[PDB]
C-alpha cells in the first residue's frame, strides 16, 4: 500500500504533459511528507534505541525511512522544517515543562502510545 501511494506521488511529480500538475503534486507530497515526519518522530521518541540485537529499525520506522528515501529531496526539506520547529522552543527558553517518562523497550507499547495520539 505504501509503495502504491509513493508510486502515485512520484508519477504525478514527474508530469509535464498536464499543465499545472507539478505544483499540485509538490504540495500534496509536501503535506504527506509532513504527516509522515510527524508520525516518524512520535514513534522514534516513544521508543528507546537499545543496542541489543542490533535491530535499529522496527517495522513502522522502516516504513517511514522508506517513504523518506523515496521522495528524498522534499523529505529532507520537510525534515529540516520539523527539526527547526522542535528546537525553536528549546533554544528560545520557552519550553513547556513536562514530567519524565520511561522509554518503551518493545514495539507494542510504542503502538499503544501512538494510537492514543
Amino acid at each position: 500500500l505504501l509503495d502504491t501511494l509513493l508510486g502515485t506521488l512520484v508519477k504525478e511529480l514527474q508530469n509535464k504533459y498536464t499543465p499545472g500538475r507539478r505544483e499540485e503534486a509538490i504540495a500534496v507530497t509536501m503535506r504527506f511528507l509532513r504527516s509522515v515526519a510527524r508520525v516518524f518522530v512520535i514513534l522514534s521518541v516513544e521508543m528507546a534505541s537499545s543496542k541489543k540485537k542490533n535491530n535499529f529499525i522496527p517495522q513502522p520506522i522502516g516504513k517511514c525511512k522508506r517513504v523518506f528515501q523515496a521522495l528524498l529531496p522534499y523529505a529532507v526539506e520537510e525534515l529540516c522544517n520539523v527539526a527547526e520547529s522542535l528546537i525553536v522552543p528549546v533554544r528560545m527558553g520557552i519550553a513547556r515543562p513536562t514530567a519524565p517518562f520511561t522509554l518503551a523497550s518493545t514495539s507494542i507499547d510504542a503502538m499503544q502510545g501512538s494510537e492514543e495520539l
Binding site: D3, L6, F40, Q69, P73, E84, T98
Partner: protein, 701 residues
Amino acid sequence: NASSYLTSASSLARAYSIVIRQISDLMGLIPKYNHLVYSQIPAAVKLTYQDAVNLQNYVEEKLIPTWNWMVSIMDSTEAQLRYGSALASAGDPGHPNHPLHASQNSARRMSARGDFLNYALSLMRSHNDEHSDVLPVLDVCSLKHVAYVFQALIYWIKAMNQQTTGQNHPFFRRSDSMTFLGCIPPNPFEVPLAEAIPLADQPHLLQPNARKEDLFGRPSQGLYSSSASSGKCLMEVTVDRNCLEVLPTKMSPPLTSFRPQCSFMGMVISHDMLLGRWRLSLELFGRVFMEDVGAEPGSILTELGGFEVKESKFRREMEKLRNQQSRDLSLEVDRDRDLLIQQTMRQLNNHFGRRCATTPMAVHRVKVTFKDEPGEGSGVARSFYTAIAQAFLSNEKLPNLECIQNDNAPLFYQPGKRGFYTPRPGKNTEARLNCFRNIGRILGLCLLQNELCPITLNRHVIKVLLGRKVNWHDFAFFDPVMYESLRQLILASQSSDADAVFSAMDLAFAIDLCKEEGGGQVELIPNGVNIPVTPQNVYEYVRKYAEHRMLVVAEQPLHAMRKGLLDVLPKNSLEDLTAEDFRLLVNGCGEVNVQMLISFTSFNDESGENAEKLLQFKRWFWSIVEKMSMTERQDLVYFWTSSPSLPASEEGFQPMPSITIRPPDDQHLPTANTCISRLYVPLYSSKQILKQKLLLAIKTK
C-alpha cells in the same frame, strides 16, 4: 510527576537529534542514490547534481542558527572549565574556594539567595572579562539539551566528512592511545618524562576514575589569533555568552561524484578539531550524560568513552561468551611450588588436549581442588590464581619441565620500576614456549572468569599481547633512567657541538646487554660494530636501541604469549581495549584504597549486643584499616577475598564481601570464607587485643 522544564528541553533536543540523524543518513544516501534506492525501491525520485548542491545549501542555511547557538554555549562553557583548571593549577589547595577541595565535592555538602547572587555576579563579571580569582559559577548537569544538539550536529559533520573520505618516523609518533583527538602531542624530547608521561614516573596513578591528561601529559592547541582570522581558529578565552555569540555571527557532472563538504562557518570543519576545542566539555559530558545522552546511535561520548564504558562492555561480552558454552573444565592444584608448576602445566595441556587447532576454547566455571585441603568454589579458584601468579613471579630458579611432552633462569624480571615484569628468554626450548603459552592461557582464563590474575606486566608486553604498535613513549615505561639518558642524548645532538661529543663518547651500532636477557654484545645492524654512532643518524640509533632493548630480545616469548592469550579469547573482544584498561581489568588497582573498601562494604552481626558497641567496633575496624600499611593491606585483602588486588570497579566482585561480628571472645582468631568472601570477626572488648588478633589473622599466608 516532576513537571520540570529541563526534562522537556532534553526531550525536544532528543527529537531534534533524531531528525538530524535522519537528515544526515538521507544526505549520505545521495552519492549512492542510483544504487541504494532508485534501483531497489520501485518508486524513486530522480536526483541530479545541481538539485543536490542546492539541497545541501538549503540544509546548511536551515542549520546555521542552531549551529551558532551551540557554538556560543560550548565556547562559553569550555572557557569557564579551562579557567577553572588554570586557577586550580595556580591556586592554593588549602583555600575553601579552590576547585580541588572537599567543599567543592557537591555531594558531601549556601542559601538560595546567596547562590543566585553568586550566579548573577559571575555573569556580570564575565560580561566584560573581570572574572579573576573567583571560580566561575556554572552547572554542566543542566546542559543536557545542548549535549543532545551538539551530538546531532557532530554526527552530521562526521557523516559528511566520512562521505568525503625529531625525524618524522611513525615509531616516534604518538599513537592513538597516546594523544588526544584534535590536539597536537607534546614534543617527546623537549619535555622531561616527569611531565610528558607522568604515568611512567608514578605507575600508581592508574585508577578507574582517571583523567587521561594526568596520566599521559597535558596537551596544547595550535589556536588563537596568530595566523588565524576565521572565527573558530581563535582559541576560546572569553567566558560570557554575548562575546561567543557575536564571534560566530560577526564573521558573516554525475550524481555519484557529489562529495559533500561542510562549511558552516565559511571554513572546512573537521570533527577532530571540534573535539579538541571542547575537550573539557566533552569529558564532563561523557562522565555525567552517559545513561541518557550516551545511548543513541553514533554517540561520540561512547566513542570517546573512558575506562568505565569499555570495562562494562568487555565484562558483559565475557559473561555472554562464557555462558555460550556448556563445557566446564577445572584443575587440580596443590601448594608445593615445583609440583604446582608441573601439575599446572600438565593439566593445562590436558585442557588443550582432545582438540586439534583453530577455534578457541571456552569454559563456564573453574573448580580448583586441593590435596589434603578442603574447599571448593570461586574462592579456591581465586586462591589458585594468586598462588600461581606469585609462584611464577618469584626471583628464584625454576623446576624442570621435561614431562611437558611426556632454560633455568626465572621467567620474569624487573627491568625498571619494581613491581613490573617482562619475559626473559633462555634457550628457547619447547618447554619454555609451552610454559609461556600456559601463562597466556591462564591470563585469558582469568579474563573470562572475571577473576584477577595477578601477573603484573610491563605496558609494551601488554601491547604485544593485544596486538598494537609500540611507540617510543611506551619505552618510557620500561625504565625512566636510561630513557631520560636517551632523551638527553637526543637533545645534545641538536647542539652545535654534537659531532665532538659523539666522537668522545665513541658509540657504535652495538648494544652491551647484561645477563637479565642473555648478556654480551649484540649488533643492531650487520657490521654495526665497525659503524660508529653519528649525530646525522642519532634518531636511527635511538630508534634501534630503544626498540631492540625490549622488542626483539624476546620475539619468541611475547610471540608465543600472543597465541597463549588468543587460544582462549577470540580476537573480537581484544579490540577497543588499551594497555591501561587491560592492566586495570586483570591486575586490578595496584594499591588498596581505604575509600575503595568503604565504597562497597556491608556489616552484619551475630553477637546480639547493642547497636552502640557494634558501631564502635566498626569505627575501630575502619581506624585500624586506615592506620595500616600497604603490605599488610594486601595481606588483609588476601585473608578477606583470597586475592591481593581489588577488581577495577564495584562490579567484578562476585559476593560483595561483607563482615560479620561473632560473640565476644579473647581467644578466637577471626575467620573468613573465600567462596563468599565473608569475614567473621570476634567482638573484642579491648583495642589492643583486637589489633593483635587482626594482625595475627592477616599475617597468615
